């Protein structure tokens, strides 16, 4: 039942007993493994036409309350039995319930802790939870968002944070942030099927224009936010330029690199995922930490369907782009990642390279083994996009499963 897990570099063995707490199903079955799929309908939390029946919600709620009081060690006290009483009374009457701020804070950190695809989980206990459940309009969402950004950025000394908007109610639409991240660069479809800017943001850029935005035409034009209040059309809000910290990219030894005009924002904040805590679903709960250099240098700038600067940089380096055996792609990629680390360090902006990051994740796997008897990790996401075997996580076997609280994917509001 309990999977035997091995590290092939050290030859050490551990038994994951935590996977037994998993109550939510993954995309896999004995017939076939679907662990490499990014978006399975299993990790997704779609709509619904009728509220979740009390039986199920009550069991998820009681479990979470059990998790919480067990964290503060008062597992069994009167406060515990009374909090359970309260949840049950509210669900029985209203078919739903509400969390306390302390409970919401414990649940958010635990959602991050439980996130299989996150390599930065060693920082899980250090999270600023902004309570925004007392928000009634898109305009208010914007103010809250601006406070999250100014706090998290911190003049370059980034701090992990999350802002939790009102949960979903059966009798209405959701509070949603249409953008996938608080900071994104525009992607303009240019006549000849070409794309100016970030190809990943083409659709969102169009929606912003459809909703009245005056677009530019640069490669790094920060998009405005489309915030949506329940059952209302999204409203456009332009982020103040002073709130959006950006780092211009230059290379430590290649003077011509800076001339490329490359740059990237400091704050990585996902805003399209759903935070589930004790049966309660929060459709708008943006979270942010700090970047791992590979996200910018490798993926964002080198992916074929993104900025794809690999060839341009190779040419500037005068590499042999004729054949692949010259490893021109590899060499160029290394220098770009190097330029990213040098630039963020020069500008005094928090950044972590993939070696430091994965080394800290291995320590985290160790902490969780003693703490909980295991740790859910998605190998393909934990192992960096370049130099995979040069890092310790590559030689570590991992078990993947769903634990709750959890950050899950959800449908696009449009």
Ligand X SMILES: C[As](C)(=O)[O-]
E strands along 198-296, which residues? 225-228, 235-237, 246-248, 263-265, 269-270, 274-277, 280-282, 287-288
Measured from the CB atom, the residue of 160 and 205 that comes closer to ligand HEM is 160
Q: Binding site annotation covers 28?
A: yes
330 touches which of ligand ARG, ligand HEM, a second copy, none (CB within 5 to 8 A by kind)? a second copy
For 328, phi and psi rounded to 5 degrees?
-60, -35
8 touches which of ligand HEM, ligand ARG, ligand X, none (CB within 5 to 8 A by kind)? ligand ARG
Using CB under 6 A as the binding rule, whether residue 8 contacts ligand X is answered as no
| 232 is known as an active-site residue | no
Q: Binding site annotation covers 112?
A: no
One of 19, 83, 118, 328 is an active-site residue; which one?
118
Measured from the CB atom, the residue of 151 and 394 that comes closer to ligand ARG is 394
| 118 is known as an active-site residue | yes
What is d(CA 354, CA 340) in angstroms, rounded to the nearest whole number? 12
| 121 is known as an active-site residue | yes
Task: Please check whether residue 159 is in contact with residue 152, taking contact to mean a CB–CB distance below 8 angstroms.
Answer: yes
CB of 307 to ligand X, least distance (A): 15
Segment contacting ligand ARG by CB under 6 A, of 25-33, 256-264, 329-337, 394-402:
394-402
Segment contacting ligand X by CB under 6 A, of 80-88, 197-205, 254-262, 401-409:
254-262
- Count the neighbouring beta carbons within 10 Å of the beta carbon of residue 117: 16
Q: Binding site annotation covers 357?
A: no
Residue 74 corresponds to which tokens in the numbers above?
């008062």
Using CB under 6 A as the binding rule, whether residue 258 contacts ligand X is answered as no
Q: How many residues bind ligand HEM (CB under 6 A)?
A: 21
Measured from the CB atom, the residue of 28 and 239 that comes closer to Zn ion is 28
Is residue 212 left, alpha or beta, with left meaning phi > 0 and alpha meaning psi from -120 to 50? left
Calculated CA dihedral for residues 278, 283, 288, 293, nearest 10 degrees: 110
- Rounded to the nearest 10 degrees, the angle between the axes of helix 54-71 and helix 78-94 is 160
> According to CB under 6 A, which one of 216, 381, 388, 395 is a site residue for ligand HEM?
381
Q: Binding site annotation covers 291?
A: yes
CB of 217 to ligand X, least distance (A): 21
What is d(CA 242, CA 153) in angstroms, rounded to the nearest whole number? 11
Task: Please check whether residue 413 is in contact with residue 176, taking contact to mean a CB–CB distance below 8 angstroms.
Answer: yes
Segment contacting ligand HEM by CB under 6 A, of 119-127, 135-143, 189-197, 309-317:
119-127
Is the sign of the CA dihedral 106, 268, 404, 413 positive or negative? positive
One of 121, 168, 184, 408 is an active-site residue; which one?
121
- The 274-277 sheet, strands edge to edge: 280-282, 274-277, 406-408
Interface of this chain with ligand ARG, residues 92 to 131, rule: CB under 6 A: none
| Of 98, 7, 4, residue with least CA distance to 358 | 7
Interface of this chain with a second copy, residues 394 to 413, rule: CB under 8 A: 394-395, 397-401
Measured from the CB atom, the residue of 16 and 250 that comes closer to ligand X is 250
Active-site residues: which are they?
118, 121, 290, 295
């Amino acid at each position: 039942k309990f999977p035997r897990v091995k590290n092939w570099e050290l030859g050490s063995i551990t038994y994951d007993t935590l996977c037994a707490q998993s109550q939510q199903d993954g995309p896999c079955t004995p017939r076939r493994c679907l662990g490499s799929l990014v978006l399975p309908r299993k990790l997704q939390t779609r709509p619904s036409p009728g509220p979740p029946p009390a039986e199920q919600l009550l069991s998820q709620a009681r479990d979470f309350i059990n998790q919480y009081y067990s964290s503060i060690k008062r597992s069994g006290s009167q406060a515990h039995e009374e909090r359970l009483q309260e949840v049950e009374a509210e669900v029985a009457s209203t078919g739903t319930y509400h969390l306390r701020e302390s409970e919401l804070v414990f649940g958010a950190k635990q959602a991050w802790r439980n996130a299989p695809r996150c390599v930065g989980r060693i920082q899980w206990g250090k999270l600023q939870v902004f309570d925004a459940r007392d928000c009634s309009s898109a305009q208010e969402m914007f103010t809250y968002i601006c406070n999250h950004i100014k706090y998290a950025t911190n003049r370059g000394n980034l701090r992990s944070a999350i802002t939790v908007f009102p949960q979903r109610a059966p009798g209405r639409g959701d509070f949603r942030i249409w953008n996938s991240q608080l900071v994104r660069y525009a992607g303009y479809r240019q006549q000849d099927g070409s794309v100016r800017g970030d190809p990943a943001n083409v659709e969102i850029t169009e929606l912003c224009i459809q909703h009245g935005w005056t677009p530019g035409n640069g490669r790094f034009d920060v998009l405005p936010l489309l915030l949506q209040a329940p059952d209302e059309a999204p409203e456009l809000f332009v982020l103040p330029p002073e709130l959006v910290l950006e780092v211009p990219l230059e290379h430590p030894t290649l003077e011509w690199f800076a001339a490329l005009g490359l740059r990237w924002y400091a704050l990585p904040a996902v805003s399209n995922m759903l935070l589930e805590i004790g049966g309660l679903e929060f459709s708008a709960a943006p979270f942010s930490g700090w970047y791992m250099s590979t996200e910018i240098g490798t993926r964002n700038l080198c992916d074929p369907h993104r900025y794809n600067i690999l060839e341009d940089v190779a040419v500037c380096m005068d590499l042999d782009t004729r054949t692949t055996s010259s490893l021109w792609k590899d060499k160029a990629a290394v220098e770009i990642n190097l330029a990213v680390l040098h630039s963020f360090q020069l500008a005094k902006v928090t950044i972590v390279d993939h070696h430091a990051a994965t080394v800290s994740f291995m320590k985290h796997l160790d902490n969780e083994q003693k703490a909980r008897g295991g740790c859910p990790a998605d190998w393909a996401w934990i192992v960096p996009p370049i130099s995979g075997s040069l890092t310790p996580v590559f030689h570590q076997e991992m078990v993947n499963y769903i634990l709750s609280p959890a950050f899950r994917y959800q449908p696009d509001p449009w």
